Symmetry: C3
Subunit: 320 residues, 3 copies
């Protein structure tokens, strides 16, 4: 209902209804702007401090361009802070940003940094991507889906891959929408029960289904939208030179799609990586790989517009 | 007449009338904005993806500032793509840009990259400078000239220098305007007959004159505007340690200006380089070195406004 | 009264009345924008060329965001010029900038560069920070003060620290406002009498007081606002490994505050540096460390708006 000033570190602390709103706004903006083509200065007179711990181009591009499109001014900062060298405690740095940008999209290596960064700033902080989550992404993913099926009502998502931030986010959000989760990670990377125990709790209070395993073609069974993501995040070399060959046996391909439902569709946050998917799937007109990618922009805008304005979506809320 | 959505990779595939229009628009914008001083949000709500294979500051500055002046948002990308490292085929990268920026000004090392980049994107791509051409530059050059002589009607341009992208562009365009070309390159760097054969063809269907040689003071004979450009593009070291001493005997100076016509004027895309010109010429009030430089901005704007808007030039078309 | 087009290299050549105006405008903008919350496109259609000899993040952030907030377009340039490599004489470079940005905020290592850069450009040049001054900073400092005491009328400032650009600027300006200076630098770093001789002259024609010494707790005596700043600017290593231990005996702390007046307050341009101040002072609610920092933005805007517009401050001038 009201999101202005509410920083976004992860969907966990977010009522489905809230997330839904965002998506709505996203959809409002994408249409009102991309479809109807009008100019929306919602963000005129506002500045976004984008902190990038690691070169994350794509995200920026989208963000930058997005924040700008609404007439805002995206300010790009790399390691001028506690990312690379930094001589001051970010517990101060926040102050500055609190005075300069009126919102911060940060992409850091540790959630840890985020909460502090947030709790130490009179400015809403946005999880541009942490080691534990990636809200704004699934945010788009969902939007994308909703657009394709025109309802997230009760579709069952299918996760094939290692247990990273993404999957997590899904968990912290799939159920809120009323969607079914079907996770599948190698007996080595189950996601810290800390969260899963949570997802199962969300699923209970929503009536959604949830279950996970180590066998893919069992998570991508009745899957409406099967989702995957590289397991080789480049975390090491020894931890894949033979470690991620114990991770072998996943490489989502049509062999999977087959077991998948009929409505079946495919998601992935990019980039490519022939390791966990063949062109067969990835390029199948059933994969919303690119539209997913696109939406990142519309979502992030809405997100901002969400926390920086009193706006209010023109256009009837979509059916979720 | 209509240019919206038409990407610009080189004047080759461009009716003179079309180029003229651009110039016109340029002149419209420069006046309506720089002379009358009004603000023109033509580019409000639009974003430009500027890809720079190599640090090309000047060009950017102009572009950036230009695209911005019209209320657009220039997005600056370096090697986050298939310029330096890149893990994905640009045949996809284009997709992203097609979704993010609604136009791309790229400055690459190979035309090759450009066409593909263009043919693989629902977005107009602009030759920010390739190894084979440099449209937007001569574009300004021309504008500059037109301004100085108030007509390109039938002046004869004089080329003294190696046969690079620039000269090429001129070729692919001088005649369209009805101007005479007088090229002069060392018996080592004649421009691949592939293009010249073309220029001679354009000259035939326009009635313009065209001829080239290896003797400068013979190309800069009746020359109205003599144009030159560094031969030392920094392509090598061995290919100039003695190779470009076989290129000796050009260094355009007043000795040239003398043989030049009376209306005579001087062009050069910068930067300095005492190798192919003395301050005598370069700084002569007859050299439009700087105004040339300036125009880059007005032209590029028009170019954008050309492909991104339905605008329509207020102010009577200039006499070309 | 009129400042448009007047470049700002240092408060020296600036009537107090002029500086005051700026501050006023600053205060006008901060209020009209930050307090009343309206959007002010004063800088729409204008571009700022920001040259940074050395990575100066903070300053930029503020500037960038500021110039943008007023609807201007900040253009960020690093060493694409005579900062690092540069192949052309800046005496030309200026020309370009004169054609691209319609104003330049430069942060260089030598004043020297600035005057030339300025005298060679039909564009106002702004001292983003030189080795000799730092106008825009004290500019904020003053603003900050004025806000806290609601008058600079006749307070006595207290300088404890080495004799750098900052102190200088204060000197070149404190008296113009009618404030008392009380400098204190180690018997090794008195500021070149060249300037001090000047400050004493300004103090004479204003009736303000001025005196300096090498004993801190003697400059921060009746001090209303005591100001300090790191002595370790990182100029060397040998020049501090034992050289700035001969600089020992300053480290402004409450022991100082005590001798300070009652109205007493504390200033510092950041960053931290436990060498010349303990958290005791620095974090005392009597320190305007952060507000100082913030103001940098409002001031710089006003500065720009000052030299780029005919604006005119809505809201009664503050009492100085
Ligand atoms: C309207 C923006 C206000 C914000 N505190 C700023 O930094 O300017
Ligand atoms: C009006 C801009 C639309 C463009 N497809 C975009 O990336 O937003
Ligand atoms: C209104 C801006 C004019 C400036 N000479 C420019 O570079 O465009």
């Amino acid at each position: 209902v009201q999101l202005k000033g509410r920083d976004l570190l992860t969907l966990k602390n977010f009522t489905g209804e809230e997330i839904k709103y965002m998506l709505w706004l996203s959809a409002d903006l994408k249409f009102r702007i991309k479809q109807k083509g009008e100019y929306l200065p919602l963000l005129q007179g506002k500045s976004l401090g984008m902190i990038f711990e690691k070169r994350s181009t794509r995200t920026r591009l989208s963000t930058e361009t997005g924040f700008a499109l609404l007439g805002g001014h995206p300010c790009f900062l790399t390691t001028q802070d506690i990312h690379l060298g930094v001589n001051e405690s970010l517990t101060d740095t926040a102050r500055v940003l609190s005075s300069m940008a009126d919102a911060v999209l940060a992409r850091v290596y540790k959630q840890s940094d985020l909460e502090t960064l947030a709790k130490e700033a009179s400015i809403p902080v946005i999880n541009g991507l942490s080691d534990l989550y990636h809200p704004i992404q699934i945010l788009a993913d969902y939007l994308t889906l909703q657009e394709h099926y025109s309802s997230l009502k009760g579709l069952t998502l299918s996760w094939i891959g290692d247990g990273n931030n993404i999957l997590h986010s899904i968990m912290m959000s799939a159920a809120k929408f009323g969607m079914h989760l079907q996770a599948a990670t190698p007996k080595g990377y189950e996601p810290d029960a800390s969260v899963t125990k949570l997802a199962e709790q969300y699923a209970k209070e929503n009536g959604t289904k949830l279950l996970l395993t180590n066998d893919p073609l069992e998570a991508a069974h009745g899957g409406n939208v099967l989702i995957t993501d590289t397991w080789i995040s480049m975390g090491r070399e020894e931890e894949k030179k033979k470690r991620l060959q114990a991770f072998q046996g996943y490489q989502v391909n049509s062999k999977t799609a087959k077991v998948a439902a009929s409505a079946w569709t495919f998601l992935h946050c990019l980039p490519r990586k022939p390791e966990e998917v063949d062109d067969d799937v990835f390029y199948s007109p059933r994969s919303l790989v690119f539209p997913e990618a696109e939406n990142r922009k519309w979502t992030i805008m809405a997100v901002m517009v969400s926390l920086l304005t009193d706006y209010s979506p023109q256009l009837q809320k979509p059916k979720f």
